[PDB]
Design a protein around this ligand. Sequence first.
Ligand SMILES: Nc1ncnc2c1ncn2[C@@H]1O[C@H](COP(=O)(O)OP(=O)(O)OC[C@H]2O[C@H](O)[C@H](O)[C@@H]2O)[C@@H](O)[C@H]1O
Length: 168
Amino acid sequence: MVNSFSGYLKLTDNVYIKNADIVEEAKKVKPTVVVNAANVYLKHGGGVAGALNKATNNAMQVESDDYIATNGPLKVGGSCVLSGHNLAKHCLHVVGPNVNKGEDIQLLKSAYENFNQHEVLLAPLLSAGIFGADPIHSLRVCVDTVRTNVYLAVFDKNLYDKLVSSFL
Ligand SMILES: Nc1ncnc2c1ncn2[C@@H]1O[C@H](COP(=O)(O)OP(=O)(O)OC[C@H]2O[C@H](O)[C@H](O)[C@@H]2O)[C@@H](O)[C@H]1O
C-alpha cells in the first residue's frame, strides 16, 4: 500500500525520519502499524506510550491491562501486537532495555528486530527517552537492524537536528 507520510528525510533505503509528534503523525496518516516504546508491564505513563494512550482516551491502557492479565509481562526486547485504536490499525508495543535500571543495551537490537515482522511502521527511537540509551545509538541500531520500511518520528527539535547531521 501507499501511505500519506510526508516531509520525511531519507536516511537509508528503508529508514526515514521527521521532527514530529508520533501522535500527530499517526492521527494524520492512520498507518497500519504505530510502534509504542513500552515497558514490560504495558503501563503507558509518559513519553510515547503515555501520549499514544492519552490520544486513545485510555483505550490502549484498558486493552493492555487485559493483555497482561492474560499473558503476563513482555520480555525486555520483546513485543506484542494490539489494536491501534483511533490512531492506526495496530500498535506494536516494543520494549527496549531500560539502560538506566541496568538492563543490557544489547537488547535494543532484539527490540528493533520485532519491526521486521511488519512491512511498514511509524515508530519512535526506542530506549532513547526515559530508558536512557544514547539517542544516536538507538538510531544506528535501528538502521542496522530494521530491513522493513520505518518512518521515525522524533518529537524533540534539538535532538532531530543533531541526529540528522550525525554519521550512521
Ligand atoms: N510524542 C512523541 N512523539 C515522538 N517521539 C517522542 C514523543 N514523546 C517522546 N518521544 C521521544 O521518543 C523517544 C523514546 O522516549 P520514551 O517514550 O521515553 O521511550 P523509552 O523507550 O526511552 O522509555 C520507555 C518508557 O517510556 C514510557 O514512559 C513507557 O511507558 C516506558 O516505561 C525519545 O527520543 C523521546 O524524545
